[PDB]
Design an enzyme around this catalytic site. Structure first.
Site, mmCIF file in Angstrom:
data_model
loop_
_atom_site.group_PDB
_atom_site.id
_atom_site.type_symbol
_atom_site.label_atom_id
_atom_site.label_comp_id
_atom_site.label_asym_id
_atom_site.label_seq_id
_atom_site.Cartn_x
_atom_site.Cartn_y
_atom_site.Cartn_z
ATOM 1 N N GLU A 121 6.674 0.167 -17.000
ATOM 2 C CA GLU A 121 7.189 1.034 -18.056
ATOM 3 C C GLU A 121 6.140 1.381 -19.116
ATOM 4 O O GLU A 121 4.977 1.626 -18.782
ATOM 5 C CB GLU A 121 8.416 0.372 -18.692
ATOM 6 N N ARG B 29 0.859 -1.176 0.000
ATOM 7 C CA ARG B 29 0.000 0.000 0.000
ATOM 8 C C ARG B 29 0.897 1.228 0.000
ATOM 9 O O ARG B 29 1.667 1.435 0.943
ATOM 10 C CB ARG B 29 -0.932 -0.003 1.214
ATOM 11 N N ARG B 30 0.792 2.039 -1.054
ATOM 12 C CA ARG B 30 1.744 3.125 -1.256
ATOM 13 C C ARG B 30 1.706 4.152 -0.135
ATOM 14 O O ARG B 30 2.711 4.829 0.103
ATOM 15 C CB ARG B 30 1.476 3.796 -2.602
ATOM 16 N N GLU C 116 -4.482 -8.079 -6.887
ATOM 17 C CA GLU C 116 -3.206 -8.785 -6.917
ATOM 18 C C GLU C 116 -3.241 -10.060 -6.085
ATOM 19 O O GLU C 116 -2.501 -11.005 -6.378
ATOM 20 C CB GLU C 116 -2.088 -7.863 -6.431
HETATM 21 N N1 LIG Z 1 -3.284 5.675 -15.019
HETATM 22 C C1 LIG Z 1 -2.247 6.114 -14.093
HETATM 23 N N2 LIG Z 1 -0.995 6.329 -14.531
HETATM 24 C C2 LIG Z 1 -0.046 6.731 -13.686
HETATM 25 N N3 LIG Z 1 -0.277 6.938 -12.400
HETATM 26 C C3 LIG Z 1 -1.553 6.733 -11.891
HETATM 27 C C4 LIG Z 1 -2.558 6.326 -12.700
HETATM 28 N N4 LIG Z 1 -3.688 6.211 -11.919
HETATM 29 C C5 LIG Z 1 -3.373 6.541 -10.680
HETATM 30 N N5 LIG Z 1 -2.064 6.868 -10.642
HETATM 31 C C6 LIG Z 1 -1.286 7.291 -9.479
HETATM 32 O O1 LIG Z 1 -0.797 6.155 -8.779
HETATM 33 C C7 LIG Z 1 -1.427 6.115 -7.476
HETATM 34 C C8 LIG Z 1 -1.833 4.705 -7.140
HETATM 35 O O2 LIG Z 1 -2.287 4.681 -5.774
HETATM 36 P P1 LIG Z 1 -3.512 3.642 -5.412
HETATM 37 O O3 LIG Z 1 -4.410 3.543 -6.579
HETATM 38 O O4 LIG Z 1 -4.297 4.159 -4.209
HETATM 39 O O5 LIG Z 1 -2.899 2.212 -5.086
HETATM 40 P P2 LIG Z 1 -2.512 1.724 -3.617
HETATM 41 O O6 LIG Z 1 -2.642 2.859 -2.676
HETATM 42 O O7 LIG Z 1 -3.423 0.639 -3.201
HETATM 43 O O8 LIG Z 1 -1.008 1.200 -3.608
HETATM 44 C C9 LIG Z 1 -0.431 0.728 -4.841
HETATM 45 C C10 LIG Z 1 -0.887 -0.689 -5.050
HETATM 46 O O9 LIG Z 1 -1.587 -0.812 -6.309
HETATM 47 C C11 LIG Z 1 -0.723 -1.356 -7.280
HETATM 48 N N6 LIG Z 1 -0.621 -0.330 -8.485
HETATM 49 C C12 LIG Z 1 0.481 -0.274 -9.254
HETATM 50 C C13 LIG Z 1 0.560 0.639 -10.321
HETATM 51 C C14 LIG Z 1 -0.552 1.507 -10.577
HETATM 52 C C15 LIG Z 1 -0.545 2.468 -11.645
HETATM 53 I I1 LIG Z 1 1.098 2.696 -12.941
HETATM 54 C C16 LIG Z 1 -1.656 3.284 -11.847
HETATM 55 C C17 LIG Z 1 -2.778 3.182 -11.022
HETATM 56 C C18 LIG Z 1 -2.793 2.253 -9.978
HETATM 57 C C19 LIG Z 1 -1.662 1.412 -9.763
HETATM 58 C C20 LIG Z 1 -1.665 0.456 -8.696
HETATM 59 C C21 LIG Z 1 0.639 -1.600 -6.621
HETATM 60 O O10 LIG Z 1 1.132 -2.879 -6.994
HETATM 61 C C22 LIG Z 1 0.315 -1.613 -5.133
HETATM 62 O O11 LIG Z 1 -0.039 -2.925 -4.711
HETATM 63 C C23 LIG Z 1 -2.655 7.010 -7.566
HETATM 64 O O12 LIG Z 1 -2.996 7.552 -6.296
HETATM 65 C C24 LIG Z 1 -2.133 8.100 -8.496
HETATM 66 O O13 LIG Z 1 -1.310 9.013 -7.777
#
Ligand SMILES: Nc1ncnc2c1ncn2[C@@H]1O[C@H](COP(=O)(O)OP(=O)(O)OC[C@H]2O[C@@H]([n+]3ccc4c(I)cccc4c3)[C@H](O)[C@@H]2O)[C@@H](O)[C@H]1O
Ligand SMILES: Nc1ncnc2c1ncn2[C@@H]1O[C@H](COP(=O)(O)OP(=O)(O)OC[C@H]2O[C@@H]([n+]3ccc4c(I)cccc4c3)[C@H](O)[C@@H]2O)[C@@H](O)[C@H]1O
Ligand SMILES: Nc1ncnc2c1ncn2[C@@H]1O[C@H](COP(=O)(O)OP(=O)(O)OC[C@H]2O[C@@H]([n+]3ccc4c(I)cccc4c3)[C@H](O)[C@@H]2O)[C@@H](O)[C@H]1O
Ligand SMILES: Nc1ncnc2c1ncn2[C@@H]1O[C@H](COP(=O)(O)OP(=O)(O)OC[C@H]2O[C@@H]([n+]3ccc4c(I)cccc4c3)[C@H](O)[C@@H]2O)[C@@H](O)[C@H]1O
Ligand SMILES: Nc1ncnc2c1ncn2[C@@H]1O[C@H](COP(=O)(O)OP(=O)(O)OC[C@H]2O[C@@H]([n+]3ccc4c(I)cccc4c3)[C@H](O)[C@@H]2O)[C@@H](O)[C@H]1O
Ligand SMILES: Nc1ncnc2c1ncn2[C@@H]1O[C@H](COP(=O)(O)OP(=O)(O)OC[C@H]2O[C@@H]([n+]3ccc4c(I)cccc4c3)[C@H](O)[C@@H]2O)[C@@H](O)[C@H]1O
Ligand SMILES: Nc1ncnc2c1ncn2[C@@H]1O[C@H](COP(=O)(O)OP(=O)(O)OC[C@H]2O[C@@H]([n+]3ccc4c(I)cccc4c3)[C@H](O)[C@@H]2O)[C@@H](O)[C@H]1O
Ligand SMILES: Nc1ncnc2c1ncn2[C@@H]1O[C@H](COP(=O)(O)OP(=O)(O)OC[C@H]2O[C@@H]([n+]3ccc4c(I)cccc4c3)[C@H](O)[C@@H]2O)[C@@H](O)[C@H]1O
EC number: 3.2.2.6
Lengths: 140, 140, 140, 140, 140, 140, 140, 140
Positions: G39, G9-10, G82
């Protein structure tokens, strides 16, 4: 026929059209404006025939320039007439923007819509040699 | 025949026309005007065959010179008659504008609507030297 | 230097004043008119100075000619101001009469009333050349 | 050093000020304008130091060009600041009229009120060629 | 053919967009930005034809960059229809994140909902040297 | 020592501060920006000494860049602290305008009033090359 | 594909997940963390397939880790998504506990309850090597 | 003897500090942390005599890493005892920031307010490789 034809509104953009004439002339262009090239006879057959024979069609856009063209379905206004001839003949329309605030297409007549879809040139008093060198770039 | 025939309103353009008549003659343009060559009792058959003879027709549009012409179906108004021979004969009309405001074409009778479609010269009191040239270029 | 200084009202005597000038200078006189010989600088000095430098003074009357001259007790009007300057120095005043109503002296400024006694020349619509002999005979 | 110095408003007389500079240059004059000759540092010195450096002073009048000069007795406005330097140093002032409506001399401040007494040159769109030669005629 | 194509909002993404173009170009890329390569004629036919030819597709995201794309089912908004043509053509969409917030995916138009499911790069001002290298890595 | 010191507001001028750093570097200049030339230790000593070093001083004026400086009697804000240093040593101040609302002097503290009296350059997104060309003319 | 997959959890487990990677790496294991190996392209397909390809599965249980998985019927939440891919492929789940107190799984979706039955590992700051060494003995 | 001394709050900095310790060691800096080196006996003269030997003084600033130091006039807090020894010896302080909200100086005892005037490093989860590289530049 002169290469550039300048279409403006008399009570709004007379000074811009005259400045555009001078700079273009110093750069080897033959320009047409009504307070210099229009002469004796009926003035209708000279404006329409002069637009067609000019390669480019500069349209000076100044505040409230197309207000008279509104609801002019019959095609009486002389800015309505000039744009129609340029579109149908298919000329290179180069609108110059000077304080113009664009409306939405449904406000204007159906015949003179395609003018809104042309790439204009911003007139800037701070960098004029850059604005003039850009206009010459568009013209053919 | 005289190069230039002048048509003016008696109670308005009399002063502009007289000022206008003299200037042309100084430039070799023989001019006709009523107060100098209108006599012989039967005056209709000379003044109508004076506007046919002269190729150039001048319509001094002093403020409200067409006021007493609306609904003149009989065409009794003298000012109306002279222009008609210019339109019927296809003369070279060169209107001179001094304060005139152009009524819409539907206002005046359809018969005389042609004169509204001729390019006109604005008489300038400050730049009279350049105004005299522009008239010369128009006159044939 | 100027010999004839012409005074008129731009709102009614413009064409009349312009017509007078062309004939006088045609015969070989020297004339000063505002819309020609006036130069760069402050003009209030020049007009009054020029009025004095002219042996001859000409006044043009016309309906509304002295409407603004009425109640000009402060001498701010330019027609009233220039008349008195020439009047005081005994300048050769040659008034020209036109179609207008003569106002009673009391309304007009008392100082300016003295010009009314001069031998004016009436402008004739049918005898233009006749008046030129009469007016130019008044001059030297 | 500069020969001419152009004052104007940037939201009413920039098109006329730009057209004026272009023509003056072709005739051998060295015209100073802010958007071209102004560079790095404090501009309150170069503007003033160039107002007094040029023989001739040119002012562009447009609809309501002096409202920002009315009741501005503090002298914070810059068109105001430029004229007083030209009025005080006794340069050649040449106003240009372009839709201007003259106010009565009382409204403006005292140090600027002597500009109203100069002889402006009407800008004519129909006779621009005659206007320019007049301006040059004034410049010395 | 332009290697890269930047699609940005004008009122907030122009500073980021212009800095990107400079750094991308120094590495040998050929970026397309409207204010540099858009020229004369109707503009819609050009960038849609240029995006289709663009190997990559940088989409600068900015606070509320996609604010104007909601409810734009007509496909008239320009950021909106710029994304669709790259989803339709299946280009390499590379969102750049500078102050953007991620909303619910439902609100956006269904034709562009696939944009939210891409890997974005977060722009950092403390580590600009590091975010530039990552961008160059996402580009093929 | 460098040639240029760049001051901005990190909340809004970071993109325009980095865009103007790379362009000025490509012209052979040495530029100090806080997130690149600032190492470890007491940064207050290094910032004040860097301002005193570079001959030129570029200040990125963006929407509200001087809002934080208002009511800054204690001189705690860091854009304020850099401007006072530049004015005191008589460097060369070159403000760059972008969406800036020019304020009345009174709002800003008396210490840094002289910044508003320097000539600046307006950043244009359409004519960026001419803007960068103008800055290099100011710099030494 | 990696030898170990880290899910976290980030907003909590980022610092721990970064300590796990730098210790598993030094023991020869190949690890997948999203911040450094994700990537260009679509990311959902790459992370729900990396769980599949991963030989081991790590779930960092830190305060508030599974709060967002609550009532995630659509299985949108990535922590939820996951786990399921890890259970389906018969992967080895090795939870790490750092200040986490497990709840009753009645509320949790029935497809996630399997996690709590796995043998957990507690992270001890005082005896890191003991917990690090035990984790590897569990990575099979 | 250790060259880098890490001060942290065990209820927050335990994870980042441990991560920061491992990266530093791999680059060749002998680091001192309590869990790894605080031997038995009496611990006050253990880490108080160490920081003086260590040239650099890294400080982890996790959320609330100096909130217990507030009004610690008795010097009871152990984070307080380490800043004072670092400052009072004039060491090289390199704060590492992670989710910190910088307080106004007056809120802290005058002894340790000098730690806020050091150029800190922002820890980035996305760009740790650059973040770790930046610390190496700040070390000695
Ligand atoms: N389309 C987009 N492109 C770029 N950045 C974006 C985005 N959308 C959203 N964000 C940003 O990324 C944050 C994600 O935070 P969250 O959605 O609350 O996830 P979590 O807090 O649960 O912890 C992370 C858990 O999710 C898995 N994970 C891994 C990679 C991810 C990606 I790349 C995107 C979205 C969710 C992901 C979730 C990871 O393996 C771990 O297990 C958001 O807040 C944005 O700032
Ligand atoms: N048997 C008679 N003998 C002598 N004088 C007579 C008369 N009967 C009637 N009048 C008088 O002429 C007036 C009519 O003029 P008006 O009423 O003002 O109309 P306009 O101003 O529009 O005309 C302006 C234009 O008409 C053309 N023009 C030229 C010659 C004309 C003549 I000879 C007579 C009438 C009109 C004429 C119009 C001329 O070229 C000018 O340019 C009446 O009132 C009478 O005083
Ligand atoms: N026979 C006559 N002679 C003298 N003056 C007359 C007149 N009739 C009418 N006026 C007066 O002149 C005004 C014109 O102003 P508008 O009617 O508002 O037209 P616009 O300003 O909208 O169009 C501006 C653009 O149209 C083209 N152009 C060129 C020449 C034109 C002429 I010659 C007449 C009418 C429209 C023209 C439009 C040209 O290219 C220009 O650049 C009217 O209002 C009347 O007061
Ligand atoms: N430090 C700054 N650097 C860059 N741009 C700044 C600025 N401060 C303010 N602006 C912006 O520039 C605009 C100027 O427009 P205004 O203030 O309405 O003046 P005006 O047009 O009424 O007078 C017209 C006459 O003033 C003389 N002139 C020349 C240069 C001037 C400068 I440079 C600044 C202010 C007034 C000036 C006046 C010149 O000779 C011209 O002929 C302001 O509104 C700001 O947007
Ligand atoms: N500083 C200025 N520069 C440029 N143009 C300005 C201006 N101020 C004002 N105008 C404009 O010029 C118009 C004329 O003035 P008006 O108010 O109409 O008076 P009139 O024409 O009825 O009298 C006619 C009699 O006065 C003598 N005369 C000669 C020259 C005059 C000048 I030069 C200015 C004003 C009155 C004058 C009067 C002339 O020789 C004749 O004998 C005004 O209306 C303004 O539009
Ligand atoms: N016929 C006309 N000629 C000249 N200027 C005109 C005009 N009509 C309108 N303006 C003016 O130019 C502005 C455009 O900005 P906006 O309308 O706010 O659009 P956005 O900022 O929301 O989207 C940002 C994205 O649109 C793409 N783009 C590129 C070129 C465009 C052109 I050329 C015109 C209109 C929209 C365009 C959008 C571009 O690639 C960028 O990345 C309008 O507001 C008008 O002031
Ligand atoms: N006689 C005893 N023997 C064994 N364990 C004892 C104990 N008395 C108390 N505890 C335990 O230690 C906790 C207090 O820790 P905390 O309240 O979180 O304060 P801190 O987080 O600021 O400390 C961390 C920062 O201070 C430095 N440091 C280093 C060593 C420390 C020691 I040894 C004790 C207390 C604080 C210390 C602080 C260190 O290098 C780092 O930088 C209590 O709850 C007990 O569980
Ligand atoms: N010791 C610390 N280490 C790391 N981060 C710290 C920190 N203390 C505080 N922050 C954080 O950094 C933010 C700065 O943003 P701001 O507070 O809006 O300041 P400014 O916008 O005025 O800056 C714009 C102009 O100031 C000059 N400049 C240069 C260096 C600065 C430093 I180093 C710290 C603070 C302000 C500085 C300003 C520079 O030349 C630039 O061009 C604060 O808000 C804190 O969150």
């Amino acid at each position: 026929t002169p290469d550039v034809f300048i279409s403006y509104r008399r009570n709004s953009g007379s000074q811009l059209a005259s400045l555009l004439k001078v700079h273009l002339q110093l750069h080897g262009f033959s320009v047409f404006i009504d307070v210099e090239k229009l002469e004796a006879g009926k003035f209708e057959d000279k404006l329409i025939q002069s637009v067609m024979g000019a390669r480019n069609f500069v349209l000076v856009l100044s505040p409230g320039a197309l207000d008279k063209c509104m609801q002019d379905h019959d095609c009486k206004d002389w800015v309505h007439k000039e744009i129609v001839t340029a579109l149908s003949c298919g000329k290179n329309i180069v609108p110059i923007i000077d304080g113009f605030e664009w409306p939405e297409p449904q406000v204007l007549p159906e015949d003179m819509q395609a003018v809104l879809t042309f790439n204009g040139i911003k007139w800037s008093h701070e960098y004029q040699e850059a604005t003039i060198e850009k206009i010459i770039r568009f013209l053919q």
